[PDB]
Amino acid sequence: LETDGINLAEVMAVPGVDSSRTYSNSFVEILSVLGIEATRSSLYKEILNVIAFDGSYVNYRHMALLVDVMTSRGYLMAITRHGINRADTGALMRCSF
Amino acid sequence: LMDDDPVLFNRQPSLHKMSMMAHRVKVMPYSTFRLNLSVTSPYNADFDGDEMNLHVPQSEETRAELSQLCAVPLQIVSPQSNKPVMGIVQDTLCGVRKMTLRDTFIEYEQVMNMLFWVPSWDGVVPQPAILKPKPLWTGKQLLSIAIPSGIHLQRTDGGNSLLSPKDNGMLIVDGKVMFGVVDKKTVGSGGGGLIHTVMREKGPKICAELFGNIQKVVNYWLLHNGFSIGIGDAIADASTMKEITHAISSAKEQVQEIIYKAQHNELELKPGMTLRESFEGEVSRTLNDARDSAGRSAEMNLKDLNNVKQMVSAGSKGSFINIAQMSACVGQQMVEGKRIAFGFADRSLPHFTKDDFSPESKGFVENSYLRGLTPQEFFFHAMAGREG
Amino acid sequence: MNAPDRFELFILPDDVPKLKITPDSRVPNCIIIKFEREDHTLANLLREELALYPDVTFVAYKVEHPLFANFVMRLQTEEGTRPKQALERACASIINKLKTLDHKFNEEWNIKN
Amino acid sequence: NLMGKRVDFSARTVISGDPNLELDQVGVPISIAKTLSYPETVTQYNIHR
Amino acid sequence: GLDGTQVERQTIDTIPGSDKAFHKRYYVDLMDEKNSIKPDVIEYAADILGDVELQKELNSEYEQLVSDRKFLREIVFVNGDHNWPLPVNLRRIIQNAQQIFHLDRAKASDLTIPEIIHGVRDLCKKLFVLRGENELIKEAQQNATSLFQCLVRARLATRRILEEFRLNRDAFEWVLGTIEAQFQRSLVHPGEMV
Amino acid sequence: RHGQKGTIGVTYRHEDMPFSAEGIVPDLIINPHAIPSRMTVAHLIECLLSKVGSIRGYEGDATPFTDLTVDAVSNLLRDNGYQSRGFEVMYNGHTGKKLMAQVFFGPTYYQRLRHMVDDKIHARARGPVQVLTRQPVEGRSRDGGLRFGEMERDCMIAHGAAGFLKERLMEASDAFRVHVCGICGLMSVIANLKKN
Amino acid sequence: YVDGEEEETIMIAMTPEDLQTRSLNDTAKRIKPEMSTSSHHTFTHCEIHPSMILGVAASIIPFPDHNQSPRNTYQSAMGKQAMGVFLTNYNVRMDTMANILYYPQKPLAKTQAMEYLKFRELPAGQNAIVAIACYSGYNQ
Amino acid sequence: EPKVNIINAQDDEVELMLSDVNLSLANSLRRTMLAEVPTLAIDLVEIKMNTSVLADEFISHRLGLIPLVSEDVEEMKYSRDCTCEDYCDECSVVLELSARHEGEEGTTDVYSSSLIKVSGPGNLNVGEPVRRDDYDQGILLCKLRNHQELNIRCIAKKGIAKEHAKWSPCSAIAFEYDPHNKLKHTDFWFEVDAKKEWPDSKYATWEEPPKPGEVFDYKAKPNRFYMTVETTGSLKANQVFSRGIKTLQEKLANVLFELENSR
Amino acid sequence: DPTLNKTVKIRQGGYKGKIGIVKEANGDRFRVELHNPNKTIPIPCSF
Amino acid sequence: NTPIGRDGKLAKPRQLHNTHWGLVCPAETPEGQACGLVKNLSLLSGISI
Amino acid sequence: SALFDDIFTVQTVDNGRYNKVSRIIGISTTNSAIKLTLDINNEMFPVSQDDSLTVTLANSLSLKSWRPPKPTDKSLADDYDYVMFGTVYKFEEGDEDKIKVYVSFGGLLMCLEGGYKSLASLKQDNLYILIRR
Amino acid sequence: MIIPVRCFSCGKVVGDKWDAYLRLLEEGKQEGDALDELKLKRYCCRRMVLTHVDLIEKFLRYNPLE
RNA sequence: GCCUGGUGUCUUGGGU
Numbered sequence A: 001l002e003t004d005g006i007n008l009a010e011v012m013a014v015p016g017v018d019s020s021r022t023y024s025n026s027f028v029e030i031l032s033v034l035g036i037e038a039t040r041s042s043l044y045k046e047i048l049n050v051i052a053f054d055g056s057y058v059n060y061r062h063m064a065l066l067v068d069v070m071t072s073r074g075y076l077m078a079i080t081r082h083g084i085n086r087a088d089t090g091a092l093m094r095c096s097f
Numbered sequence B: 001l002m003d004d005d006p007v008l009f010n011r012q013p014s015l016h017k018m019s020m021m022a023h024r025v026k027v028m029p030y031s032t033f034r035l036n037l038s039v040t041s042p043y044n045a046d047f048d049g050d051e052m053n054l055h056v057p058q059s060e061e062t063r064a065e066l067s068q069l070c071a072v073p074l075q076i077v078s079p080q081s082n083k084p085v086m087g088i089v090q091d092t093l094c095g096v097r098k099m100t101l102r103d104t105f106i107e108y109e110q111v112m113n114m115l116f117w118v119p120s121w122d123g124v125v126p127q128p129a130i131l132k133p134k135p136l137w138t139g140k141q142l143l144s145i146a147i148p149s150g151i152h153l154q155r156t157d158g159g160n161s162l163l164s165p166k167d168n169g170m171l172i173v174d175g176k177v178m179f180g181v182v183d184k185k186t187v188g189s190g191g192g193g194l195i196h197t198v199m200r201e202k203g204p205k206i207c208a209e210l211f212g213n214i215q216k217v218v219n220y221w222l223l224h225n226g227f228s229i230g231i232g233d234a235i236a237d238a239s240t241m242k243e244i245t246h247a248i249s250s251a252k253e254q255v256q257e258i259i260y261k262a263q264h265n266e267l268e269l270k271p272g273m274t275l276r277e278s279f280e281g282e283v284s285r286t287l288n289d290a291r292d293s294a295g296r297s298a299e300m301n302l303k304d305l306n307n308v309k310q311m312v313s314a315g316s317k318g319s320f321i322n323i324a325q326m327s328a329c330v331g332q333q334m335v336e337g338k339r340i341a342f343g344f345a346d347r348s349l350p351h352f353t354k355d356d357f358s359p360e361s362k363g364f365v366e367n368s369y370l371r372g373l374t375p376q377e378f379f380f381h382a383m384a385g386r387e388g
Numbered sequence C: 001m002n003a004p005d006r007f008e009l010f011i012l013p014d015d016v017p018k019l020k021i022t023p024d025s026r027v028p029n030c031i032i033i034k035f036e037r038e039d040h041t042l043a044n045l046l047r048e049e050l051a052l053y054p055d056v057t058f059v060a061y062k063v064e065h066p067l068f069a070n071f072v073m074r075l076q077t078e079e080g081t082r083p084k085q086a087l088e089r090a091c092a093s094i095i096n097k098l099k100t101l102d103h104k105f106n107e108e109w110n111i112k113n
Numbered sequence D: 001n002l003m004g005k006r007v008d009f010s011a012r013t014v015i016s017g018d019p020n021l022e023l024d025q026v027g028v029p030i031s032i033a034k035t036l037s038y039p040e041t042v043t044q045y046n047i048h049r
Numbered sequence E: 001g002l003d004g005t006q007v008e009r010q011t012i013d014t015i016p017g018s019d020k021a022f023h024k025r026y027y028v029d030l031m032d033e034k035n036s037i038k039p040d041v042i043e044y045a046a047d048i049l050g051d052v053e054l055q056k057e058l059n060s061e062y063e064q065l066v067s068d069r070k071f072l073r074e075i076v077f078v079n080g081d082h083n084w085p086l087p088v089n090l091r092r093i094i095q096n097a098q099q100i101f102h103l104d105r106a107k108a109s110d111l112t113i114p115e116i117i118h119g120v121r122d123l124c125k126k127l128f129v130l131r132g133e134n135e136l137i138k139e140a141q142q143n144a145t146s147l148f149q150c151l152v153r154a155r156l157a158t159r160r161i162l163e164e165f166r167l168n169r170d171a172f173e174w175v176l177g178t179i180e181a182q183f184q185r186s187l188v189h190p191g192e193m194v
Numbered sequence F: 001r002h003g004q005k006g007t008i009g010v011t012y013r014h015e016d017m018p019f020s021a022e023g024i025v026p027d028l029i030i031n032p033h034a035i036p037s038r039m040t041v042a043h044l045i046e047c048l049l050s051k052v053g054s055i056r057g058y059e060g061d062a063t064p065f066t067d068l069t070v071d072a073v074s075n076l077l078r079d080n081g082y083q084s085r086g087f088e089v090m091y092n093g094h095t096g097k098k099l100m101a102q103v104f105f106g107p108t109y110y111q112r113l114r115h116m117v118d119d120k121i122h123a124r125a126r127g128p129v130q131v132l133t134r135q136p137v138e139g140r141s142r143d144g145g146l147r148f149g150e151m152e153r154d155c156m157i158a159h160g161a162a163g164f165l166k167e168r169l170m171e172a173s174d175a176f177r178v179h180v181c182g183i184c185g186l187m188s189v190i191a192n193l194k195k196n
Numbered sequence G: 001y002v003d004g005e006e007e008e009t010i011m012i013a014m015t016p017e018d019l020q021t022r023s024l025n026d027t028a029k030r031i032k033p034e035m036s037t038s039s040h041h042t043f044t045h046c047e048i049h050p051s052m053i054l055g056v057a058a059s060i061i062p063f064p065d066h067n068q069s070p071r072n073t074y075q076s077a078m079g080k081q082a083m084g085v086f087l088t089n090y091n092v093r094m095d096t097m098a099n100i101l102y103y104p105q106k107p108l109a110k111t112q113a114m115e116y117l118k119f120r121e122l123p124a125g126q127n128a129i130v131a132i133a134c135y136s137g138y139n140q
Numbered sequence H: 001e002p003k004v005n006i007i008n009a010q011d012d013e014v015e016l017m018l019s020d021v022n023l024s025l026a027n028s029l030r031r032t033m034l035a036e037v038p039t040l041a042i043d044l045v046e047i048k049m050n051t052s053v054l055a056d057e058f059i060s061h062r063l064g065l066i067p068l069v070s071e072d073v074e075e076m077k078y079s080r081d082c083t084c085e086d087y088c089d090e091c092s093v094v095l096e097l098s099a100r101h102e103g104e105e106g107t108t109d110v111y112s113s114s115l116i117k118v119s120g121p122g123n124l125n126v127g128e129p130v131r132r133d134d135y136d137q138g139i140l141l142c143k144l145r146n147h148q149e150l151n152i153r154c155i156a157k158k159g160i161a162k163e164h165a166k167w168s169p170c171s172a173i174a175f176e177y178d179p180h181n182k183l184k185h186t187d188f189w190f191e192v193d194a195k196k197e198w199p200d201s202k203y204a205t206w207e208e209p210p211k212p213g214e215v216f217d218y219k220a221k222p223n224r225f226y227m228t229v230e231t232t233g234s235l236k237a238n239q240v241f242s243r244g245i246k247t248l249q250e251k252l253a254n255v256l257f258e259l260e261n262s263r
Numbered sequence I: 001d002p003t004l005n006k007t008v009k010i011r012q013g014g015y016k017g018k019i020g021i022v023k024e025a026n027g028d029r030f031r032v033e034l035h036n037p038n039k040t041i042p043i044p045c046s047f
Numbered sequence J: 001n002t003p004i005g006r007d008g009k010l011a012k013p014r015q016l017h018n019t020h021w022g023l024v025c026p027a028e029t030p031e032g033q034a035c036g037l038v039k040n041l042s043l044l045s046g047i048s049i
Numbered sequence K: 001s002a003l004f005d006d007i008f009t010v011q012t013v014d015n016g017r018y019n020k021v022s023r024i025i026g027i028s029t030t031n032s033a034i035k036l037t038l039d040i041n042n043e044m045f046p047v048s049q050d051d052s053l054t055v056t057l058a059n060s061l062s063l064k065s066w067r068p069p070k071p072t073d074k075s076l077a078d079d080y081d082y083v084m085f086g087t088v089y090k091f092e093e094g095d096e097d098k099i100k101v102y103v104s105f106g107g108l109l110m111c112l113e114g115g116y117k118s119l120a121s122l123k124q125d126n127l128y129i130l131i132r133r
Numbered sequence L: 001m002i003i004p005v006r007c008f009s010c011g012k013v014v015g016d017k018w019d020a021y022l023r024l025l026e027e028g029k030q031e032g033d034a035l036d037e038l039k040l041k042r043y044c045c046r047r048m049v050l051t052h053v054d055l056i057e058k059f060l061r062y063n064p065l066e
Numbered sequence M: 001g002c003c004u005g006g007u008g009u010c011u012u013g014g015g016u
Ligand SMILES: [Mg+2]
Pocket: B045, B046, B047, B048, B049, B050, M016
């Protein structure tokens, strides 16, 4: 089955549903339900699907590198000023963005 | 500045690291920068007015950094997709398919020139494929001179046997082509092709000579064979057109049936879709399959000698859809992922009546570019084109 | 601004020899002849003539770049004959054929006059 | 001015293709070649040159 | 630990096929004569059959291959895909060895069985990504090359070395040295702005 | 007039061009690969129509949305002694040997655009600087220097050419020497170098 | 005269020939639409000529109905950059920049609308003899 | 052994068949006549007055293209090889032109027939602008209206077409061989039937068609080359063919000289 | 030097008979800005 | 000229709308930032006085 | 002085794909299950169906840099009409007596099928093929 | 601007045939026939005369600037 | 008798 809209926690508990394999394309919700390591795999799956769709192929290590940066703090750091410049990096580096 | 000084060469926008590679200067008359043609691809350069930038290192330390890290042969394989980003292109790629056809033969007098055109040639003329009644070499033998020894590559296209009736696949043993037309699948930029293989076995220096050797042989041979294209090559014969016209005529009838069913409540609803979405979806699938079917008919009728077919088959420019649109049917025009909208009240143009959902009303261009477009079709084509 | 002088196609600089012969010692009895300030016009004429001689085993030429009026010819002969001598023979043959050819045109021309 | 800036020893012009150049070569117009320069240090091995 | 320019799609041959086709390809039976190695490819064929001590190695070989296939099919590559980007392409290295040493011939090979099994097993300890004797490093070093070791063992299996590739003593020692040298060359270089 | 634009790649004198049997040589050779993916079929038809037009002596009417067909133009052309699709046998100029393929050949209207190379070529060794930044000035008309932008910076990082990047942005541009105080770290030092 | 608002309420035939029904099978020429959704049409107006939908720049293109649509846009831009003879009094005007082609020729393939744009009287280009061929590889 | 058969002839074009030679020799003769047969042509224009509507170098450019009688040019030296100080009578011809329109109405057309030879290497027949008849005004150079004057001095020099196309004595050179394609050097493009769709050569009746049974003679070579040399009147057609052969001889002779001197 | 910027005619070489102006006269080798093509040439003083 | 800007992406003022037929040219429009916003009157257009 | 010799009847001549090459299949008149598949140049050596062809395979024509043959010397090829030189690229040690030998003459391909006793000597690096009549 | 001296493509002189061409058009000959009478047989030469535009007649109308 | 300075801020139109 596939749904419009999400409620990952409640749907997992429903008898009949294989509770060990249910997947959502909102990784923000995955983080709240399954934790940071599951978010890593889900983030990778969603990026790869985008790139591979128009037949392109990017070697694993590049997409892997991007998602480790996005999950190293334990929460999702967006690639915007609100994420990037909340780091303990030097002021000259941060002000250049 | 003098011969063999390294300089950094660069075209904007610098989207990835092979936008900046080190080249060796050769001073020449006339005011343009000259590039060997096989580097146009990584720069995404062409010669329609593009400009490029050159930077000269100013010390002993940076000259060495350029030649040992940034130099062109080191950049042949890119880390982006573990495959080459440079291959044989355009004229040389079109020509190398023609030259390595099974029935290309070259007499002795021309063969001697071609061997001498290879800078890396060892001076040993190879024995002709035919000794009697007249010495004749095949194209595959002379191309093989440009490939260094010790190179083995095997590829199977469509489960071919070692007897290769269709002259497809590829087999290379000790740097000599046993069988197989050489096309985009072997000397293009694809992974696992010829260029990738020479790089692993021989290193970047030898692999850089491979580009130069192949180019000098093929462009000479192609100069004396010639190649052209004309208006004749877009024209399918009268028998094929009636097939073409029938498949489009029958597709317009099926679209009529769909309109009838949807208006008489006899149409199946697709999951997740309203009636009008389902209706619009089914019509679009029918019309795109109609053009592909008509395109397939036009393609198969074209003889092997037809010049449009030779470029499509080589992979050097063009694809199936281009044969289809020049000769058979331009097909459905799309805007914002949907058919042409009713920008007038309930109609697409003031030359139609309201509530007309037929193919011609909502942007199906029946004619080919050869035949010429009608005025209604023309505007719709300009709408789709503008969006691009 | 960077166009070269057009007269440089045929006028020889004083420090530049019209003709230069070097050996190709990698194989026996092979020379490289570099022709300065010449074209396909001269080169193709010599090449075919040479190829019909029985003692020439290899002859070829290339114009390496059309923006420079030169070409280089490679000539290998069998052990008996010396390549440079064979080139002289090819030259004299063609001068003779053109002398004959000029004569026969003159005769035919007066008849139509 | 700091993350990027204008620089000396640069040049720019229209490009053309040439099949009779090696892969790693670039043909450079004479006029450009007389304006750009490289500072070569004088040693015992090149002083005569 | 690898550089992106140095990998190519290679097939890992212990993943596809049925258990029967697998067993046909990899198993050596020194008891049942018709399921042993063909006699015309080895010189020492007489001293082979019946040897229980040589059968202990070949059993340990096949048991190792069974572990790999079970690990890869149930944990690593659940969907059965067996073509994957991997370092240093063994197929090309072998067919080059066939050319240098003219490895045509039915001339029975002088390459003994214990040289093969011990040769390959010793190779997998020299594929150094990280050096140092610390206990954690050795675990990390073994983990980094787990997939590649399976790839090597799937190719340099006893039956394939002898029946299919037909290597002799000179060529096989060369193949081991080349794999060892090229794997080192395929490591990413420190300082790379990845 | 069909969006098929190009720059001159080389020039050839009269006798090196390919020629037709009548001794007509082209003024200009464009590339066959420009046609199939761009699908400028009108360019070919214009060539065909203009061939007919120059033989019979009039300017063909090429207005869009008329009854003129390719076959009608082709019929006229064959009746004048030329192959009906516009092809002609041609001969290689270097050797005199025939080309194995025949070449589409005929008049086409070409237009000279304003972009000429001697209006674009530019080089700078050293030269004038801005008063404010002491960096090279902007623009061809002022002997300016090319911009080493943010994206070119990134490419040199990817190459790992750290030494080259340092030199470009200092010695080859606006390098300056300052004095600092080892205690307070400010550029407040007053340095008279002849008095030391 | 009709404007955009009144155009919404009228029914326009594309050419005079479409005003009357007809009695072909020429495999080269273009297919005319069937128009079988309405049984009988009641036309109120007719286009004077459909080629007048183009503007000044696009009217210089011979056969625009045979081109992929972006090429007509690209030529409409480039046409404004092509040297010709911008006026006949160039010797007495002192403009910042002016370009005059030495030997303008009128094109062998023209359109009817060019008569009024004066293009044959002030042409901007030359008829080159063109071979489409792969020659030395200096035209890739 | 080379044979020639002249099919037609007149002052400014010779049509001829060339036979029993190699393809390369026929082609080298074609190239030599276009590119290396010397002629005489204006190469320096001194404008003392030009008040016409045409730009100075525009008029000068047209002057360079005017064909001049070049019959005795072989005895004349190149300017670059003459031992003299500036020009003189041995290396140049001087021409002068002066036109003017008096009257407030009408247009004075300046024609190439107003070019007056002033000096020249007497008594060699060189330097007069070529004329068809005696009442032929010749080539249009300029047009003048009331008070506009053109007074120029032109220096004509010996040159070859390699330097600039104005020195070429030929126009087109028609050239073909093997009208029925017996050698199979071309592979014909066709839609339905190759023979009906390709026109016949204008020399189709000078050779016999291939017989319907006939096998392919893989030893046959090209052997008959029909060519027509048109000229601009700067040289007569018979002179161009003769001097083409002569010029090609000295070039080969010069190569032969250098080998016997380099030892 | 007394001959800079004065008009000059060339009496030997490939540019014999052409007008020019002395642009730079450092020593032995002059720089004449030729009138006829837009080029400034290096030339010896004997010419 | 339509004075909408360069601020505001989308497509609606830039698209060739159906009602442009016969009033502005379907082909003539600049490349780049002004694309689709600057238009040109068809040959037979007029403007009400 | 040769490695193989036999006479073949031509069963099929496939033109189709090319104008100058045809594929021929033949079976030995004297020994069935010995089959020959061979590409040949049409214009130089036209063959028809049911033609009898003597096919010899040698590893040398003597009774590295190719030279135009002198008219004075003499080789095995003086008595044949059509000679080709090629590379053996597959030696199939097949089932009971199914042996196939694949040779490439510059992309003109040959498959020779037959028995071990007839073809054991053909395990060579290079082969000439000589065709008579 | 004014009739070119030479055909661009082949070099045959055509600058002496412009006056003869205008006179033939007054006598009612068609363009193709007029070119035929002048012996301009190759179509490279024909384009030169058929498509030239004579602008110099317009520039002369601007009353001389001395 | 060596050194040797010619603007900026915008706007608009273009090129890839
Ligand atoms: Mg571009």
